[model samples]
Target: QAGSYNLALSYSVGLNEVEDHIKNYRPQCLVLTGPPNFRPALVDFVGTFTRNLSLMICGHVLIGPHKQRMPELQLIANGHTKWLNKRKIKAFYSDVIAEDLRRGVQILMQAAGLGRMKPNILVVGFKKNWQSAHPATVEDYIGILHDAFDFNYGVCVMRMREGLNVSKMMQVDPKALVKEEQATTIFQSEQGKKTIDIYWLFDDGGLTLLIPYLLGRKRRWSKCKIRVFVGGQINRMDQERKAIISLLSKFRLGFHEVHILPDINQNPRAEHTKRFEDMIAPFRLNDGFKDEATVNEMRRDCPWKISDEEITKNRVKSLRQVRLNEIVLDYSRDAALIVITLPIGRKGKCPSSLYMAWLETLSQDLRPPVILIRGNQENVLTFYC
Candidate 1:
């Protein structure tokens, strides 16, 4: 089951020398593998040679002494460059040379197969754990990945920490046999299959759920109901919810319910904002540190110099968890899953600590899994076939 092609092999040091030999060979498809130092020449080769070529797979292997210890593959369409197989290698090896050589070959082979075969990938998930408070969201997510990669995937229904699961962690041999089942029919007829209630916070993050809606429709759940929760002032909240409902209806996600929750962080009349304004009034306009009495005098006359932007930002930064916890505990406690978008972090900074704190706060003491997902704002899913 292999395509017919003339495979050419060459061992050359420099790009000019490689090009000199390649001109005589004149191959249609090229597969190149070398150490990290060859990367510059590799890039140049693709940009230069691919003008006359059809396809090329460049495997940049990290072996011996190199800046990057991780293995990576570079793919070029004509001349455009991109990275694939970015999954980090996380194993410890006692033998450095042995491990380096082994991993280097891995990168090369993976690049070759990816270029030649164009195989579909399947990512397996635990059905039981995924069933947590929001099975529909999880299932719909799995389906969307299938759509993205154009692959067929399945989930396993099993308990946690089983031998099979452990074997999966270690990367076992052979694939599981597949028997296709009518998921929709079986899901509806099952006696124990319960309605899935999901609470999605209304924000820019809500755009991520559109694909889920499409896939969720096809992979029918017993009942997957997602209610929108928008947090802000109660006054005019009806109009806000309706605006959101109109937007949701435009996509035909079939989500009718929209609820308004009081956002204490955004509340202009909140005591925290009042306290913050009162404390910072003196410092904003103050050019120099003054005596205690002088500072106290300036506090009132400083005219609350803090801008609305500064106050609002500070409020959310400090009390995001407070408002999140308030709404979840008060309204959405019974829901099986909470679908909240991961907050965008500052550029050029590692937001691990901040994200950890935020995530911990969001999911703390929650029975249902809080699905935190982010998208690059790319149109991966389309409305029409």
Candidate 2:
């Protein structure tokens, strides 16, 4: 429903852009490019830029080259950039150019008082071996993160069409997935960007969704570095740790650290448990202790009475529910937290919905002040509040 609403709002704002141009310029209408052809997409993008200018006083937009092979879109971006420079326009690229277009259009519409709306940018990625698998994973995670963090931007990555049969691919309908949102392609380059292809699994999807969200919200990056907290036994912990570190490293993203909370079987003494408990103990009290109630109660009674075995067991269980909460509280304290958990073996799989619900709970407990990065079924990260 929210997705549909977003689609409606995007279209409404787009229509408003057209209407405003007609009213002031007395122009009958404008033509823009459409799919499978670069001409329409480029024309529409440039037209939007012109429309944006006519609506605002001294307001301008920036564009950049869209890489070779995308000549139409690239030409539009180049034309706008050159035109603005000639006029000494103060416009600059707002991170990704396409994203700026979407945001700029939304802002303009809201200023025009079309209606109250929150338009989000959702990006998805696809890969070859996975076929429809990767896109589905991305969709699920994007839906979860949207509900959890109230994120305004969404991005996904998928492999370009490969050996899969056309009919098989139709099941996922990647086009339909992002049809309502402004969509663009990231051209592959040999030297410019190194491509990392992996099996079509949920982890890849989770990681892909997370990267754009983190990059888009640069303000949060300033508050503190992103820290990913992983919970599970040391063996699986080792694997998750490598996965997270390697991924972040590839992006050359600094200020990210991986923490392995002692698993139930490993630390049995609960020594590693105290850190998490202390971080979340305060908020848990006022928030009604939805997660780790027994652990919190145990700590409250003696703060030391709970046996290491009991502490460790409860810690693992609590990690499921309270982990996200603790990370959020940490962020509130001017620190960031990324809580990762391995739901393998009998614990089975943890649905993205549960994590979303936990995040919703956290949001009510605190402001919408936390960034949740879920790492497939293996790991997760949360940024500061």
Candidate 3:
């Protein structure tokens, strides 16, 4: 015949009564219930049983909100409960029952004899005003709640959402929502649909610092497509450009492309034109005004005659040309992830001019992904998020 055991521990604590019960009748399982503060003594009793005999099952009855005391009780209860679970002994937390309390009790009682049972789901219902004035307390409570019920995918229902204030709830921990699988799905509407995953190369300078959340919201929930935009003056442009091209050649990565907008303002003439002759030769006249030879002769005769005003004008035209190129690139995409490089030093040592220029170009609503590569530290890339 299969044997069964049941030990129910109540508020009035003393080892003598429990010892007598253990000595006279050996129970295969134990159930402890009461206010949260009563846990320490209860834990001592359970520890005694675990050392002498094998526990087939374990359970707890969590009685009150008990506020700050819940985490301590849960830590002790969960530790022993997990031990029982490893031996195929089922464990249950009674307060988790959603529909019927008696049904939960019956399940616990049956599981004691069987040595195995389904994990219990704890449904917690709260009064509307329980956390009205103490918003931080509510956040702490929910955090504990998340940990307690996370194993069973627990659902917490707040009858009056307004009383608790959803905004205050959100402020609890921005990343907490990321861990909640159910909350992430249920609160999908509020969280939005577009989520853009951004990968950047360097530090999260001011531009990227200001926009990580906005970008996350836009990409994850809004369903907006993603594009990568890089800005910098590479030391070896030819090699860097070739390396990028080769990297793209390996895979068929789709959805937009990478653009390298060199800082033409750094050295205007070198970027816009080849040699001086290459520049002037293009403008040479071959018709009635002069033949190619005559034009060549004139160019040679006045090689040093190019006015400073003309050079200045050409530089202005080149700046405009680069700006137009960027404008065309910007028009091709609705949103972009822009990476930038920055010089480094102590707090106030670096220049803010470059960062300011980038910020000014972005729309008020659009915050681009910025990567700040530090000049001093070549290996380190500090990310904002």
Backbone N/Cα/C clashes per model: 2, 25, 17
Q: How do the residues 214-265 of candidate 3 rate in per-residue lDDT, one tens digit apiece?
A: 3333324245444434445555444654654443343222334545545334
Order of quality (TM-score): 1, 2, 3
- For candidate 1, report its TM-score: 0.39
Question: Higher lDDT: candidate 1 or 3?
Answer: 1
Per-residue lDDT of 227-332 in model 1, one digit per residue for the tens?
A: 5565556666567657555655555656665666665455333553344345334334232324522754654443233223223343365365445655676677
Off by over 4 Å in 2: 1-204, 207-223, 235-240, 263-319, 327-333, 336-359, 362-364, 373-385
1 versus 2: better TM-score goes to = 1
TM-score of each: 0.39, 0.28, 0.23
Model 2 / residue 142 / CA error / Å: 14
Model 2 per-residue lDDT tens digits across residues 210-231: 4323332333233334444444
Model 2 lDDT, residue 248, Cα: 53
Best by TM-score: 1
**Candidate 1 ranges with C-alpha deviation above 4 Å:** 1-202, 205-207, 218-222, 238-243, 263-315, 348-351, 378-385
